[PDB]
Design an enzyme around this catalytic site. Structure first.
Site, PDB file in Angstrom:
ATOM      1  N   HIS A  38      -3.556  -5.528   0.304  1.00 31.69           N
ATOM      2  CA  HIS A  38      -3.056  -6.069   1.565  1.00 31.69           C
ATOM      3  C   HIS A  38      -2.996  -7.586   1.484  1.00 31.69           C
ATOM      4  O   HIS A  38      -4.030  -8.256   1.628  1.00 31.69           O
ATOM      5  CB  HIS A  38      -3.951  -5.640   2.729  1.00 31.69           C
ATOM      6  N   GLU A  55      -1.469  -9.514   3.671  1.00 30.18           N
ATOM      7  CA  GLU A  55      -1.378 -10.093   5.004  1.00 30.18           C
ATOM      8  C   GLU A  55      -2.737 -10.491   5.560  1.00 30.18           C
ATOM      9  O   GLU A  55      -2.796 -11.242   6.538  1.00 30.18           O
ATOM     10  CB  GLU A  55      -0.686  -9.119   5.957  1.00 30.18           C
ATOM     11  N   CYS A  68       0.815  -1.211   0.000  1.00 23.75           N
ATOM     12  CA  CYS A  68       0.000   0.000   0.000  1.00 23.75           C
ATOM     13  C   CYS A  68       0.852   1.265   0.000  1.00 23.75           C
ATOM     14  O   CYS A  68       1.277   1.726  -1.062  1.00 23.75           O
ATOM     15  CB  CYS A  68      -0.960   0.002   1.192  1.00 23.75           C
TER      16      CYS A  68
END
Ligand code: CTP
Ligand code: CTP
Ligand code: CTP
Ligand code: ONL
Ligand code: ONL
Ligand code: ONL
Ligand code: ADE
Ligand code: ADE
Ligand code: ADE
Ligand code: MG
Ligand code: MG
Ligand code: MG
Lengths: 526, 526, 526
Positions: free
Chosen positions: C497, C499, C378
């Site tokens: 993202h 994760e 990001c």
């Protein structure tokens, strides 16, 4: 007029309430005030004489013969006010008194209830204990929020209302746990404990927080916000290595000034010079001796709390670090004399029963035949005499009538059985040619007794001829109190309890001499 | 500096908390102090405008246009401080404000919690309400021990700590039940309620005990003993016939002296002469008239509490006992005009909806054609105009656009629909030749409005020609406010609410004239 | 039929409630059951989007675009049920919904109270979340005994009564502290917490005890005796090194069998083979690399919980121990590039604001010019593009319109400003010649977004000519999602993202490749 401080605990027990109360009383006594402490136990036992050492710990003996808790030993170690029966009582005592009166008819046919009558009895005892002092510290056993301690809390709330809130303070102890996950100290249990105490009807005036580390200022501000307590009255008491630093910590946090402001007392600034001296002496040893204590209650170390502290006090006077090793008597009985090796001195404290007595006799034999310094207290004195009579005077299994009722050689027996327990302080006369005379440096001494069986005077002459000397005797019947082995570097046995009179600021001649003998023995054996 | 009294209730609700707070404020105002009262409601409703009359009661309108509870009506009847939006707020209002701020981003990304943020909002509102007065009475709705009122209690506890306990008092109301079995009054519920309040964290300073009879001295001593409250601060308030005796009772028990001692105020002795005058006037009537009130919320009498009290006040000024009979509008609609017989006067109060409006039109017709005194308020004025236009001016089923959107003759309509709700106090001009001019004895009056639909000015000229006169008009658009029938002994209808300004010590000209007309009608109809 | 387990905590917060609930759900899922978890937060914030990372931690993004708590990240890591908006809500959400309905008039003029209406809203949300599953785990935030969580507890008690006690269980978490003084574990706080929960109206069915060590059997028997809970239902959960052992511990203590007995479920024995595989992989590393994460919220590590766990998961797949070092961006800004030395790889996670962005640009420059493996997420992708455009394409201080509104070279800007936040899972197309294509081994991927500013397509052609390649694009406007540096061992930056989709049992291709590159770099640099 008399001021009252009521000390309670929350969250968990075993926070160290007696130590904190003793330290606060020490601070107040350092300012010239006349203080006293009393302990309230929520036990059904009328007195701790029935209780065994492996449940609560050693039994403390006052000057007047009362049997009490270890807390009174703490208090006598911290302040210079002599305790008595008025400084400790239990729930069972109050209930027994009220039941006796009701059976006798003192209540005139009224219904005997808890809130009027039980709490009236509690208040009467508290007032009679506190009469004649400037400040009274009343410690309440049990945790706040338990069935067992509700009558005590109700009584103290009523007493606070009757006496007046300008002469009564409430002090609450709590646990501030530390959580390693977030790495913070948590204040929620303290909040809930204060809520429970408020539900009972008491508003705390002081919060004492117990934790591994010091409580941060933000946490204390949070506690003050949530508990109606001023921010200055939230006092942190972290874990310490020495209990003698606690008065200094509480003094630095300003607890004494706050208490004196609330009670309108104009007392000079605290002088804690003696406590600083004790800390300095403790922090700087010059030697290290190891003392072997052999006894039967080794499992619970609180069975010998006073004796351990007295050995430490003697070490402080002799500037020697003392390392206490606990040896089980049955181990000596079975394994043998192997355990007793590598010891600069040996101590045998008191006890009841026959279990382990043979190991104690073996230990006394080993110490006497190896010239290792030996101290014997109550039961230890008896086993030393038994060993001396058997293995030096050839008495062929002489014993005490306590253990074997008929052994044909009752060296130790009841005063009736020469062919009721002695309690309190008695006077004793010291012989001029003995070690204890030069130790005490006085013609006579006063010590406390908690024994039943005595030394048989009929058989005493033979043992005296064998070589054993008598160093002290009673007043009327010349009961033997102190004995000594002459052909020994240091071998003293006493019938009384010298550990109930040793203090870190004054010490005790007997234990100081014992520790000095241990140091000399190690220097010789090096 | 500003002093705060916080009033809470326990055991049960409906104890009469607002009346007691109003009486205490009346006593304090009689001593020359500047007092105010504020009400805290644990409701999710942002304001009572959405609430219906048959749930909580009539909606009170302040000078500035706020809609509040009946408690503010009580307060305005008891003290001479004008209420506003600052004197009443709910839980829903606080939550709405905080949610608005959080969405707007005023909290800078912090977590918005209850204890900091909600209680901060509550404290801010309480302080802004109480600013500029000697004493502030804060009444907390709900019972102590409920989920709904915990934020309020936490906020007031924190506020008491911050402000100082020498400027804050806590007052608790309880129920002392009477058991006919033993014939005693029981104090246990009060004890448990005090315990709950203490568990929250508040210690009461005053206990007010509510019972059918007076609480005996021994019971009060027991309450003082169990609740940490001084015996003088346990105040008995029995049930009374008249709420105007309550200030006298509280004054006789010494509540005012205790409050003034705690707050260190040196105010002269209370002069309760006006309240004694009201009691004397009430106790000695000389006549008895019966007034028929016809409305739609007859099931719950609290829907007309202000109107009932205003009729009673007018009777007090006229020394006439007033007997209010409640008549359901649908009963008149179905059963007929039989119920309206045996009535010295008829009152039609306000309301919303079409259910029962036809019965109200029938009632206005009957009163106008039988020369029975008539008073019309808001909706009653509209139905009176509708009846006059239809049955005297032949408008062929003229109605309001509120009920029938299209009826070809909108005598009552929104100001837009002449072919948003008016709230607060407005000024009105009185015509010199009318009854209301001689009643008010003033060129202009100020009254409060809570209506939406108005009288159509386009169709007004025809009805005026038919005979109906207009007695009052607005300021800008000359909206009709008061009408009158000339060929009637007493026939007055108003668009505003005169019951929101009548007080037992001053009265109200309109209701006094209405009750006098009722008395004259009964004397004529003998 | 649907079964409900309600999980609450006592004594202190931060006990690890979400982890325990996730482990229990994992055990139940291993037995073939259809389970789900939902989280109830006592916050006034409507959603955590307003909350900042340095207060509660990272914001979790669901597939459908909801913003939630870290607990939902835990749950998605532990079970294979996709979360949504139905799995998490706050107090503020419930109050907003009810206030909206009341203003709209849905309650028909009734009084909106807490107990009926708020708890009805809570129950409705819980039922809608749990519909269609065999077991629902409902975790309640806050400690039992707080004002903030009373509505939730009341709602769940009512729900348990309505649904039936043969389909509802209550599970309570407590702290069992260890006191070093006595060397014991204390059970009193658990007793008082159970008492508080009972006072609310809930009887626990299972007690989970949290401590440093395992709770002894005698202590558990005491807890069972004092808390009305069977002795088998007192479950010990000690502190562990790995959260992946917790399901095994709970399974060994028999929690699953007890739950299945109470709910009358006949499910096969649990198969925990995958969790044992994860434990085996974790316990046996073969290497050790150090990864430098540079970001602005370094003070609170919970701001990067998902990213840290994803790096650990990649290490587990690569059998490499991963050592995360946290580097503050302002440190790089001031101190320089000295801190970034001794790092096998560098990761730049996302964030908001301009503070520290220059340090991130410096870090991206250093990694790109030193051939140190780099991962950008990001904000990291944006700073990497800014650095590449400025220091390789000579754009003369090109920046984002987020930071400087007018810089003449808006490489990063809103889609409007090419000269509303994207939320949820979107589809992306991978270019066939790039690294990410061989990593994912799929033509297209689906990932989650939480950004506002995008990459300017107008200025993209020049940077592409300069050498930077684009590896992924959106579906409609061909927004750039993935970029790559060709002349680098490993240099990948992504707009989404990754994760939020890595699990210890499946991993993630991107982080596995990143950690493998780190290992290869260290082997080269040795
Ligand atoms: N009497 C109180 C005090 C606190 N809160 C709430 O509890 C939460 C705080 O969480 P917690 O950390 O458990 O409270 P602390 O006061 O910080 O307790 P601790 O010191 O143990 O962390 C806040 O949202 C607050 O609104 C509450 O509901 N009731
Ligand atoms: N906090 C209290 C107060 C009272 N008692 C007990 O309660 C009994 C009194 O009975 P009860 O009449 O119910 O108490 P009262 O105070 O007289 O309550 P009430 O005024 O309702 O009669 C007494 O035995 C007293 O010991 C108690 O246990 N706890
Ligand atoms: N509900 C209870 C439980 C215990 N007791 C009393 O509390 C004392 C026990 O002391 P404590 O160690 O604090 O209780 P434990 O149950 O052992 O608590 P912990 O596990 O923390 O040691 C006993 O005398 C017992 O009579 C009580 O009054 N009320
Ligand atoms: C004092 C003591 O340890 C007791 C010893 C023995 N049992 C006795 O004399 O009572
Ligand atoms: C004021 C009142 O009773 C309302 C009457 C009617 N509905 C109106 O004007 O709104
Ligand atoms: C996703 C993230 O970290 C935000 C980066 C930047 N502020 C944006 O695109 O909104
Ligand atoms: N602060 C403290 N540290 C250690 N033991 C204690 N016992 C009582 N208070 C103590
Ligand atoms: N004493 C009292 N009597 C009757 N009603 C009341 N309302 C409030 N107090 C009252
Ligand atoms: N048993 C446990 N050990 C460590 N962290 C935990 N978090 C939750 N449960 C835990
Ligand atoms: Mg906290
Ligand atoms: Mg009674
Ligand atoms: Mg215990």
């Amino acid at each position: 007029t008399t001021n009252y401080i009521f000390v309670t605990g929350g969250v968990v027990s075993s926070l160290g309430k007696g130590i904190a109360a003793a330290s606060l009383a020490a601070i107040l006594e350092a300012r010239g005030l006349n203080v006293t402490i009393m302990k309230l136990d929520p036990y059904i036992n009328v007195d701790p004489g029935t209780m065994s050492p492996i449940q609560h710990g050693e039994v403390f003996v006052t000057e007047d013969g009362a049997e009490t808790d270890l807390d009174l030993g703490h208090y006598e170690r911290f302040i210079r006010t002599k305790m008595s029966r008025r400084n400790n009582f239990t729930t069972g005592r109050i209930y027994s008194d009220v039941l006796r009166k009701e059976r006798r008819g003192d209540y005139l046919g009224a219904t005997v209830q808890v809130i009027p009558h039980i709490t009236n009895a509690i208040k009467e005892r508290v007032l009679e204990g506190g009469e004649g002092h400037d400040v009274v510290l009343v410690e309440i056993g049990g945790t706040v929020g338990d069935i067992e301690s509700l009558p005590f809390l109700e009584a103290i709330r009523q007493m606070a209302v009757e006496i007046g809130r300008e002469h009564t303070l409430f002090m609450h102890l709590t646990l501030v746990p530390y959580m390693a996950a977030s790495g913070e100290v948590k204040t929620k249990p303290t909040q809930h404990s204060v809520k429970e105490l408020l539900s009972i009807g008491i508003q705390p005036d002081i919060l004492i927080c117990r934790s591994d580390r010091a409580v941060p200022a933000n946490e204390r501000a949070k506690i003050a916000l949530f508990c109606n307590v001023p921010e200055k009255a939230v006092i942190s008491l972290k874990d310490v290595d020495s209990i003698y630093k606690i008065p200094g910590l509480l003094k630095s946090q300003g607890l004494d000034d706050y208490i004196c402001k609330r009670f309108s007392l104009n007392c000079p600034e605290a002088n804690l010079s003696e406590w600083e001296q004790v800390i300095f002496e403790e922090a700087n040893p010059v030697s290290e001796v190891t003392i072997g204590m052999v006894g039967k209650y080794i499992e619970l170390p609180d069975a010998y709390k006073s004796v351990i502290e007295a050995l430490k006090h003697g070490g402080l006077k002799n500037r020697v670090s003392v390392n206490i090793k606990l040896i089980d008597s049955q181990d000596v009985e079975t394994r043998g004399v192997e355990i007793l090796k590598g010891l600069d001195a040996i101590l045998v404290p008191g006890g009841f029963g026959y279990r382990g007595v043979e190991g104690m006799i073996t230990t006394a034999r080993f110490a006497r035949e190896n010239n290792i310094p030996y101290l014997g207290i109550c039961l230890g004195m008896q086993v030393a005499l038994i060993d001396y009579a058997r293995h030096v005077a050839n008495m062929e299994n002489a014993n005490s009538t306590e253990f074997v009722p008929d052994c044909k050689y009752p060296v130790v027996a009841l005063i009736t059985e020469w062919r009721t327990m002695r309690l309190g302080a008695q006077q004793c006369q010291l012989v001029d040619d003995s070690l204890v005379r030069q130790l005490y440096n006085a013609p006579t001494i006063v010590e406390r007794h908690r024994h039943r069986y005595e030394v048989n005077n009929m058989l005493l002459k033979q043992i005296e001829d064998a070589g054993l000397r008598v160093a002290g005797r009673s007043g009327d019947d010349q009961l033997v109190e102190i004995i000594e082995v002459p052909n020994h570097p240091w071998f003293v046995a006493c019938q009384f309890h010298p550990e109930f009179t040793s203090t870190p600021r004054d010490g005790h001649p007997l234990f100081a001499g014992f520790v000095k003998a241990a140091s000399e023995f190690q220097k010789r054996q090096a």
